Design a protein around this ligand. Structure first.
Ligand SMILES: [Zn+2]
Lengths: 50, 158, 184, 101, 57
RNA sequence: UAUGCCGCCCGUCUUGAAACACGGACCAAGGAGUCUAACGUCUAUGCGAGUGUUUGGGUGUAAAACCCAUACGCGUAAUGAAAGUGAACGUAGGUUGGGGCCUCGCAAGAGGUGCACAAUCGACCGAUCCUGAUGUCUUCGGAUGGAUUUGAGUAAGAGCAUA
RNA sequence: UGACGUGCAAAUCGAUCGUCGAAUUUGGGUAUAGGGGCGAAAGACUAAUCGAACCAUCUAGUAGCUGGUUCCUGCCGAAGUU
RNA sequence: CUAUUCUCAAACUUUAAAUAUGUAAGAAGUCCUUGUUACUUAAUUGAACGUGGACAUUUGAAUGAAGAGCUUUUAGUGGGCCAUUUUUGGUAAGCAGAACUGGCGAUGCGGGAUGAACCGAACGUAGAGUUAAGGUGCCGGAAUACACGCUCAUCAGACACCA
RNA sequence: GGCUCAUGGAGAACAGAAAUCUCCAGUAGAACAAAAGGGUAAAAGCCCCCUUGAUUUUGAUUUUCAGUGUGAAUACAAACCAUGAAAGUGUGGCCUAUCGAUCCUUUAGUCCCUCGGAAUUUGAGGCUAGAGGUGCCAGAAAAGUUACCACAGGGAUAACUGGCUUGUGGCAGUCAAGCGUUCAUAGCGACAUUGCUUUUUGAUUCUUCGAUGUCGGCUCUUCCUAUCAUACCGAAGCAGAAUUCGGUAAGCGUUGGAUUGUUCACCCACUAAUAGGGAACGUGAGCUGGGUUUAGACCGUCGUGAGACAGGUUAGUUUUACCCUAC
RNA sequence: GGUUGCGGCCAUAUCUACCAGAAAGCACCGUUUCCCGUCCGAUCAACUGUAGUUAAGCUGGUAAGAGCCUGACCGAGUAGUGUAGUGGGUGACCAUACGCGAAACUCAGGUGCUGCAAUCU
């Protein structure tokens, strides 16, 4: 279970990591939510900077 | 267990010789060794310092280093599928010169003499050596040599 | 039929670029033609150097070009780089030259033009020098890539260990000093 | 064996750098100190439930020991360690000789 | 239960791709040569370099 | 289909399988080197002393595409446990090779210049062992020059990103 | 050591036999629950399961061990040794 | 003790093979002058490396050369077995263990009737021709060929490994 | 630096085989710490004089070898020393063996570095070289038992057959010193020596561990001949009868019982005789189940004990044919 | 040619017995104040070259000598061994083909040669 001649790696995957993998598909969906969130806050705080 | 010591299996080779025991004769020490000089390796068991391993006994190398009581020899050591550059440190009683290289280095001067001579004369030198040629056509004369008719022998005990 | 060598062994050399680049194949086409017809040893070198891969066409710096023209008698030759010609801001003096590269960098193009020189391709070169008349073929250093310092590591080679972190606690303790066991 | 006593050996010194007479004694190791990092580490790890968190060597093979001489130069007072081969009995020295009865 | 050692096929393996000479460079390994010969030899070669740097006119 | 000759049952472990060694009554469908984080080599692509837009912002025909600031990662400097110190005597060195190019030539060749790379001798940086100048908070400073010592170093940068 | 032994039956059938007024047989209720019970003691019994029940989960546990591992052609072609 | 005598030695030996085995057979060569050096020399002697000249037809034995050198990476394997010869243990073995080589493994094909290993030959698909080992009474392609002898068995003999 | 050792020889009161003395020979036949081999004669040996190269600095090299480590060794270089008139020799033992990683602890070195907000002294941590050790010697920290047992495997490996072998067993020759009144061979036969067999027992581990039902008996068939009887013969130390030794010969038969599970053995009795064997040590979907060898149990000896015993003893499930072939 | 001093190879030089040696040299030899070492001026040390000497050493020669070193078509192309065969033989082993090739034994010869420096009727 040791190399031919390879750098000694430290891959921290001996826990149940598969149960708390967080993939960011929500990136684009959050981006429009943040822009809408800014637009609505600027409508509320009507003439003033955010 | 098994024995793989340094001087193991070396009863008969580091043995001295019959009626050649005792002291080393002084020509051995008066002999001059220089770098690029091809030398044999053959240990003198009577001298137990700078002595070569039994492997190198019989080998021929070339001197690379020269110091006080000793030389340095380069030998070709095949191990598996490839030679390495094995550097020995040998006291001067365990080596000698190679007439191998002495007979070449005099043939070089013999060729130099033949060519430098025959450049300004009638030339048929052929500097290269040729092997044992098939013998030429001779007449064998039977004047007091009338061939003796040999026959094969009958069997007899003792 | 006691075969002396390996039967059906390939030459082991590139006969084409594994690059599928259209413009490189047009350039190979020109130089396969010139290589065949001209019978000048230059054209065979350029054809092979075009086949060569990214690891074997390392960037020849302007500073290395300036040095190759510092040579006596070879001061007015056209500088054939088969690969990238990179910039070097280390030097200040650069002479008037003509250099035939595959690619230049925006910095290298600026420096060679500003000296007053001519940035050539291999086809702009071939149209003026079919036999590489008055050329100086250069190569960048191959054995300087960071991968080559790990090639044939062992005791006691003095080669780079393949590692990811480089401080103490990382491959200095036992077998790198006589204190802890031994050294290499 | 029998190492005599005071002998003239080389002294590193920084002042000597020559053969001076060093007084010879046998080496013996001090105390664990109870404050060495490897003792504090051990005591921490040994405290609590678990019980023997480290190995205990009980496979004694070697009979004797390597004897070590603490040579001490008389001028500068600097010491040096010389290790002798494995010997059963050790005399710091010594009833020489008697080089023939 | 097993067997222990054989040098069978070991020649064949060696000769297949191998038995090769160490290539012998000019200017050989000047390492493990007498240190005081080296110490001097440096100054000799530096002297010869200066003497040809003087000769270049 | 007949006839001459040939043809042991496949898959498997095995030095050795037709085996009196194992699985297999038969058929349909399902059924076993995948994806991921991090990496070695080699190759392609971009840009190249740099490189990488996409964590984020702006924008949009709306999870797309397009545009973008400041950082940050890696590289551009190594060596020491560390406080530290830190890469040109010279044409960035000499030597033997070295493709290609230049010169004289019909050519054979000779001569010159010689990249990469190869060997070698040096020089430069850090470490270790000394050497120990001008000086001076009189114990600090470490010039200067050496060492069969040492480093994963310098010596007209090759790398970054992606596949 | 009969029958049956792909049975009537995952323990039955037939003959022969032990004992048959008590340390007897037995229904209902109730208590004892798994490293625990219960045992006139065979590691016996604890729902056809017992030298540690059954159910789910951790769990797709691990296996230097067995078995399997799915198209064709072309070229090259090993090891059982250190 | 002396001179003779018979026979021996894995762990005796004067002598001493065969087979295997080291090295050399030249440009990095030879020859003649001369240059530094802190090494060495009584020395102006050397030693290492050179400058400058001189000798390339025979470039300093034969034969071959299928291109020669170089590097990176990674698969499988790490139970092997058999045969002539050398050889250890053992009464011995289709036994156990070695040495060199060749084979099987991983190999079909012609032959030994059959057989992993023996002999002959190693293999794209066909035609034609010629042979190997082995055979040519009949099965069975091919002389119940030729030639000189031997043998008569109420248990004939008949092709190496091999029965 | 002086000398020559083993042993032998000739000799000197007590003194002799051996105490000490003297000369002669003496190639090592002695000695060198040990095993063995090599080496050594104005020495490497024995006796005497002075010392501490068994030292400091680190590098290269050889053996084992991956050209890693460890151990041991080599040759220099730079210091400092020892000896000697000097040449020189000396980096432990004349040479080939005598030994040990990380982590931890401890010591030696050095006006050293660190303890990160800044100082000092303890304290701790570092840097370079040792030591405390791993003998399973490239280095786990470790007692049994299972006949209540389990799982993954294994014919890489045992307990039965079979196969090569034939030591061992069984049978059979050759030679014949001799035993048999005399007389080698009527019948036997020493010392040797050549076989054959696979009804013993071994040796081996080739087949089988996703099982080939593991002793004996009962029943039943067939075959082998190394012939017990019978048929017909030859030989004799064959008068008869009886017996013994062979030949052709396996056609023909070769038993009833007591004890034992036994195969084997041992007795009684009849018979012409109560020969030896094979056929998966024939024969368990043919039986039987006494023995063997699951679980219960007792005794002895052993074990602190669980338990052990190819020691003894008692109780202990023997499944399926309807398929093909053979008959 | 002789001898010495220092040697090279290290028995053709050593061993055993005898017999010669002019010159010079070497030696034996003489003495014990000194340096020096002994139990003993025996060995070692110093002095003399005088008192004597070739008897020893040393050198040379001799011997059907020992030993050693050479050579041979001496034994012997033997023993052995590399290679080859569907050679032989129950086997043990053996013959042939192509190569390589001893040791003993027998007989013949030999008995140091040479370097440097100095000396010598
Ligand atoms: Zn001191």
């Amino acid at each position: 279970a040791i190399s031919k001649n390879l750098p000694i790696l430290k891959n921290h995957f001996r826990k149940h990591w598969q149960e708390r993998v967080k993939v960011h598909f929500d990136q684009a969906g959050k981006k429009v939510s943040r822009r809408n969130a800014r637009a609505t806050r600027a409508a509320k705080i009507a003439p003033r900077p955010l | 267990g098994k024995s793989h010591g340094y001087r193991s299996r070396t009863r008969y080779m580091f043995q001295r010789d019959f009626r050649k025991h005792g002291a080393v004769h002084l020509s051995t020490y008066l002999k001059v060794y220089k770098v690029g000089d091809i030398v044999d390796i053959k240990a003198n068991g009577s001298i137990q310092k700078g002595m070569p391993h039994k492997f190198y006994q019989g080998k021929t190398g070339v001197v690379y280093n020269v110091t006080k009581s000793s030389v340095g020899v380069i030998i070709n050591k095949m191990v598996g599928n490839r030679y390495l550059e094995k550097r020995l440190n040998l006291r001067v009683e365990h080596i000698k010169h190679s007439k191998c290289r002495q007979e070449f280095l005099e043939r070089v001067k013999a060729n130099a003499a033949k060519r430098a001579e025959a450049k300004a004369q009638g030339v048929a030198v052929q500097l290269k050596r040729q092997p044992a040629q098939p013998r030429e056509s001779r007449i064998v004369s039977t004047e007091g040599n009338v061939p003796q008719t040999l026959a094969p022998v009958p069997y007899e005990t003792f | 039929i006691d075969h002396t060598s390996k039967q059906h062994k390939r030459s082991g050399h590139r006969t084409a670029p594994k690059s599928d680049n259209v413009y490189l194949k047009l350039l190979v086409k020109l130089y396969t033609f010139l290589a065949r017809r001209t019978d000048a040893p230059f054209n065979k070198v350029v054809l092979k150097a075009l086949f060569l891969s990214k690891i074997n066409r390392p960037p020849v710096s302007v500073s290395r070009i300036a040095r190759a023209l510092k040579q006596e008698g070879a001061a007015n030759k056209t500088v054939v780089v088969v690969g990238t010609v990179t910039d070097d801001a280390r030097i200040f003096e650069f002479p008037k030259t003509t250099v035939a590269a595959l690619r230049f960098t925006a910095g290298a193009r600026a420096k060679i033009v500003k000296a007053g020189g001519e940035c050539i391709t291999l086809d702009q070169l071939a149209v003026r020098a079919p036999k590489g008349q008055n050329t100086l073929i250069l190569r960048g250093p191959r054995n300087s890539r960071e991968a080559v310092r790990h090639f044939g590591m062992g005791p006691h080679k003095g080669k780079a260990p393949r590692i990811l972190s480089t401080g103490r606690k990382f491959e200095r303790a036992r077998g790198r000093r006589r204190s802890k066991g031994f050294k290499v | 064996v029998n190492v005599p006593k005071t002998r003239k050996t080389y002294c590193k010194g920084k002042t000597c750098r020559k053969h001076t007479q060093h007084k010879v004694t046998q080496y013996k190791a001090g105390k664990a100190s109870l404050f060495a990092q490897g003792k504090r580490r051990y005591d921490r790890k040994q405290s609590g439930f678990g019980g023997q968190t480290k190995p205990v060597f009980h496979k004694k093979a070697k009979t004797t020991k390597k004897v070590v001489l603490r040579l001490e130069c008389v001028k500068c007072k600097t010491r040096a360690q010389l290790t002798l081969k494995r010997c059963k009995h050790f005399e710091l020295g010594g009833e020489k000789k008697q080089k023939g009865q | 239960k097993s067997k222990n050692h054989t040098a069978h096929n070991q020649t064949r393996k060696a000769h297949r791709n191998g038995i090769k000479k160490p290539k012998t460079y000019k200017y050989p390994s000047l390492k493990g040569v007498d240190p005081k010969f080296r110490r001097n030899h440096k100054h000799a070669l530096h002297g010869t370099a200066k003497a040809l740097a003087a000769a270049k006119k």
